[PDB]
Write a protein that binds this ligand. Structure first.
Ligand code: HEC
Ligand code: HEC
Ligand code: HEC
Ligand code: HEC
Ligand code: HEC
Ligand code: HEC
Ligand code: HEC
Ligand code: HEC
Ligand code: CL
Ligand code: CL
Ligand code: CL
Ligand code: CL
Ligand code: CL
Ligand code: CL
Ligand code: CL
Ligand code: CL
Ligand code: CL
Ligand code: CL
Ligand code: CL
Lengths: 471, 469
């Protein structure tokens, strides 16, 4: 299959009237700026084949490429897909000198949640745009002309068919200048409104504090976003999660437990441990439960006067600039609470919904996706998810998160009841044991999980075994 | 001695024309409400004698008592003072039923700094008004009639002569209703503004368990050295409230509300970003000298003491905007450095004039039943050599704005510089950063023009920074 692919890429098949693919995509698979021919080298074979079939189906049209896509046989398609997927990545990109690639960095890496509900390109396209599996292709090293053409296509409807209409929604929220900057930005990578709602605005990401405090704010922002991979916090993280995955826009997003609403609210009484909690104590709670620190290398939450807690507290403090001390009800805090359903919650409808609207990113078995060790799509159950003591294991809490925040891009927004059903499906799977586990599921259940929205201990596992055994 | 005093108290002296003192002050020395006769039992003999001489001088006048004071000889005065000071405390006080003693609790125990720059009565008269040495007499158990007459006398000029005219300034700031309430309050105790942030009133505590923590932090702040929870981490005779006046509420006396919103922060003193908890542990390390405490350690950072103090500081800061590092009132007002330097000899004069009355001739301060009334300013029970207050600029900024306690006197900046240099040119507990050499420790941690550690400005010009061993 690599042999048919090679001969089609390098020489074509004169008999069948098929030109060499390298005539336009070049010998290294690196693309061509002048023709707007894509990079093919190293792309996921399933993606290449899907794109050839998109051309054939009319979801994509290009006067140059569509005819070569129609002349392929199915066996030819699979061969060239495997050939280009086996190549070493390569790029023959060259961005224009008249376009400021730095102007795209903001959207590429942090998006625009506040004005456009728009995630960063890298939130789906992987770190630095190297791709995130077969669904989500790389942008890094694709020629400028090719990237800009696709964005122009989706923004006008001359390209469609992708899952959940995701790129139509993205392209629809960009202006022409941003399209050029984003294309130049990703073409030059290496291959390896609150006022009108009366809501708080955190400081711009350019406005860091001066001097050493600013360096710590930056570190706290990176520990928040890369909790599981940074050498300082990783030894205290026992799963494949980051703070940013449940606190969207790196802690800035109203209705996704923004950190600015939390800073001014602690110290506070918390019924979960029957105790008043500082911000540090709270952050250590998150390491204990959402980051599963017991299964970390260190086995422990981070030291309370160490650099990790100091940076995280500095970052959170900074996001809260201007907010009124002691306001425990800032608009945007936490997740919007839902009315509990009169008629319960149905994990079977939930599994249908999850397959429809979530599995694309989070996986058919909740396994999530990691790229070069970074969390792209968090695992939602199993041994690399949050553990049974984490707040997100509750049905009401996760339902409120989901209804307001998932799917990531708001082409779809679930009803409360749909959110309740999907939340009950997700949180009825095993995940790491409660750190408060006593040895007995019933006992641990009666002391720490005695709520109608907590399925720990209920007989909903495999062949009706009780939930709450771990992995 | 005590024997002449007794027979003067119990029988008088027929010959010299002296009636028995117990006829009005009673046998137990507890006073008498009907006569307005004072409690004498347990008062400091120096105070009793000073008062008798006040009558003789005309600084005090009362037609009932003045004649018995003029009939005493110097030997007699010393004798009766000795007898009444050796007696067990006692009181025959009985306050009116038509006067609400709780209306005095506020002024008695927390003052009115914000509107009248007026300290609590116990700030000078000791815990629960039981007295603070010879200068400061007890109010507890004094008859209502007696206390109110004295407060009325000072308010009209029928009593004077007390040091720095302190009680004339105090009584001048009370209305008649408050005078009755305070007298009722102390007779019934046992014998053992605009453009600036406003913290919450002391009645407006939070609901539930946070409120109990805020309460606790307020008392650790006020009683740091005696409370069982914080005392094991305090190695000197200090409290937070002593340098952070009005228990952390007073603008220009490093209020806590301006600090809550300023941390985390880079601090040049340790080259690092410090949380509020880390900042507070530093205060234990230096201002409270935790090294010479029982535990030898500062309080644990997620322990009860730190949690309570941070809850209290948080509460005081209600409403303040996060991240405002320049709230008006923060810290102490910075002084322009003197082109004339600072003169410890000038300073020692001023200290004897305006400070020793309370802080002691030798800076020793005063304690009553373990509570800090007047902090030691040097010696083994003061802040140590790493504490901010040991710096001349910092202490001068505190003094110029806040001492003497009551604003009948306010030093000029140059005076504040001079007194600060005198105070901070005395020995005190060693820097916790001491590395074995005074010269090295001075070069690494005290190389500033406003720091005298290491310089030869001590007793007979000895190098400062040797500690108290
Ligand atoms: C942030 C503004 C961006 C930019 C500049 C791009 N994307 Fe996406 N993208 C997504 C999916 C599912 C696809 C595959 C579509 C299909 O199957 O046909 C894409 C593809 C692209 C391309 C085309 C790449 C190619 O090889 O042709 C380009 C140029 C592109 N994207 C730019 C999904 C998402 C998201 C999921 C919610 C988010 C966010 C983005 N993309 C963000 C961006
Ligand atoms: C020039 C005449 C070309 C020849 C010969 C081939 N391709 Fe091509 N291809 C070309 C252009 C100009 C483009 C961009 C089209 C657009 O919509 O802008 C393409 C695109 C592809 C893609 C999609 C890439 C992606 O990132 O999604 C694939 C998978 C692709 N081409 C495969 C391909 C194969 C297998 C060829 C030989 C059979 C081939 N192309 C020839 C221009 C030209
Ligand atoms: C999902 C698995 C999460 C991950 C990973 C992290 N957090 Fe979290 N956090 C989460 C929820 C569902 C809630 C609210 C409900 C509850 O009772 O737990 C929180 C709350 C916080 C807070 C307090 C917010 C407030 O009171 O307004 C803080 C300060 C917080 N979380 C910090 C935090 C950090 C620093 C994380 C990475 C170490 C982190 N969280 C991960 C869900 C999840
Ligand atoms: C890709 C386009 C996604 C789809 C479709 C859905 N989710 Fe998602 N989710 C996605 C990302 C990138 C993240 C992390 C956010 C970040 O900034 O890094 C998430 C996060 C969650 C979480 C938080 C739990 C955790 O352990 O991190 C939950 C509970 C979650 N998502 C649920 C969820 C459901 C139920 C969906 C279908 C309705 C769904 N997601 C769609 C990316 C995508
Ligand atoms: C009734 C005729 C009395 C006799 C006999 C003595 N004292 Fe007296 N004393 C009396 C009154 C009504 C007052 C209050 C005067 C005022 O200005 O309000 C006093 C006051 C004193 C004081 C001052 C106490 C203080 O707390 O400052 C002292 C020290 C005192 N009296 C001592 C004293 C002695 C030693 C006596 C025997 C020689 C004596 N008093 C007799 C009423 C009467
Ligand atoms: C320090 C600035 C003081 C504050 C604050 C208060 N008082 Fe005071 N008081 C002070 C001194 C130095 C003296 C001694 C007077 C003397 O002649 O030496 C006093 C005395 C009193 C007395 C007289 C007691 C007696 O036995 O005669 C009373 C009744 C008194 N003080 C009341 C009082 C009240 C109610 C205060 C709070 C409002 C208060 N004092 C504060 C110094 C200081
Ligand atoms: C004098 C001997 C002090 C004692 C006892 C305590 N503190 Fe202190 N503190 C003191 C000084 C001179 C300063 C610096 C002020 C300046 O203008 O330079 C401080 C500072 C603090 C701060 C930071 C305030 C801010 O940044 O605005 C806090 C939070 C603080 N101090 C708390 C504190 C506590 C809780 C104490 C009892 C445990 C305490 N201090 C004692 C002087 C003295
Ligand atoms: C009694 C009337 C006082 C006079 C006169 C002076 N001071 Fe004072 N001082 C007094 C009290 C009760 C306190 C503690 C306040 C509290 O609310 O508990 C203080 C505090 C100081 C401090 C803080 C230092 C510390 O180690 O705690 C300093 C540096 C200080 N005072 C200096 C000072 C000087 C220089 C004075 C003469 C100008 C002076 N004080 C007069 C009570 C009294
Ligand atoms: Cl994002
Ligand atoms: Cl990939
Ligand atoms: Cl058009
Ligand atoms: Cl569109
Ligand atoms: Cl940043
Ligand atoms: Cl695991
Ligand atoms: Cl485990
Ligand atoms: Cl009288
Ligand atoms: Cl006071
Ligand atoms: Cl209080
Ligand atoms: Cl108080």
């Amino acid at each position: 299959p690599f042999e048919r692919g090679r001969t089609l890429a390098e020489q074509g098949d004169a008999a069948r009237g098929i030109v060499a693919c390298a005539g336009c995509h070049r010998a290294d698979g690196g693309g061509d700026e002048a023709l707007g021919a894509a990079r093919l080298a190293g792309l996921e074979p399933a993606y290449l084949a899907t794109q050839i079939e998109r051309f054939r189906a009319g979801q994509r049209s290009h006067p140059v490429m569509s005819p070569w896509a129609e002349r392929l046989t199915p066996v030819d398609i699979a061969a060239v897909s495997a050939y280009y997927g086996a190549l070493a990545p390569a790029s023959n990109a060259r961005a224009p000198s008249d376009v400021d690639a730095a102007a795209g960095r903001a959207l590429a890496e942090t998006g625009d949640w506040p004005e456009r509900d728009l995630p960063a390109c890298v939130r789906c396209h992987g770190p630095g745009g190297v791709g995130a599996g077969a669904v989500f292709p790389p942008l890094a090293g694709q020629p400028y002309s090719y990237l800009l053409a696709q964005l122009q296509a989706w923004g006008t409807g001359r390209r469609h068919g992708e899952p959940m209409a995701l790129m139509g929604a993205v392209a629809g929220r960009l202006d022409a200048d941003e399209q050029r900057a984003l294309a130049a930005y990703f073409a030059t990578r290496p291959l390896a409104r609150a006022e009108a709602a009366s809501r708080f605005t955190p400081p711009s990401r350019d406005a860091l504090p001066e001097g050493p405090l600013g360096e710590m704010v930056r570190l706290g922002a990176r520990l928040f976003r890369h909790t599981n991979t940074d050498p300082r916090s990783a030894p205290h993280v026992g799963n494949d999660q980051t703070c940013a995955g449940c606190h969207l826009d790196n802690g800035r997003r109203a209705d996704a437990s923004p950190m600015w609403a939390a800073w001014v609210a602690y110290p506070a009484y918390r019924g979960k441990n029957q105790r008043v909690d500082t911000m540090a104590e709270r952050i250590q709670g998150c390491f204990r439960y959402s980051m599963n620190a017991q299964d970390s290398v260190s086995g422990q939450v981070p030291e309370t006067n160490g650099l990790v807690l100091d940076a995280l507290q500095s970052y959170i403090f900074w996001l809260a600039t201007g907010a009124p001390t002691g306001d425990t009800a800032m608009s945007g805090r936490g997740y919007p609470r839902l009315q509990p359903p009169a008629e319960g919650f149905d994990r079977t409808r939930g599994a249908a919904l999850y397959a429809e609207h979530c599995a694309l990113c989070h996986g058919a078995e909740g396994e999530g996706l990691l790229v070069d060790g970074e969390v792209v799509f968090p695992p939602l159950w199993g041994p690399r998810s949050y553990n049974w003591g984490a707040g997100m294991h509750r049905v009401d809490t996760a339902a409120a998160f989901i209804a307001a925040n998932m799917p990531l891009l708001d082409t779809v927004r679930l009803t409360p009841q749909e959110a309740w059903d999907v939340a009950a499906y997700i949180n009825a799977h095993e995940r790491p044991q409660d750190p408060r586990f006593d040895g007995s599921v019933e006992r641990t259940a009666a002391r720490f999980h005695a709520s109608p929205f907590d399925l720990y201990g209920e007989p909903l596992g495999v062949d009706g075994a009780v939930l709450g055994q771990g992995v």
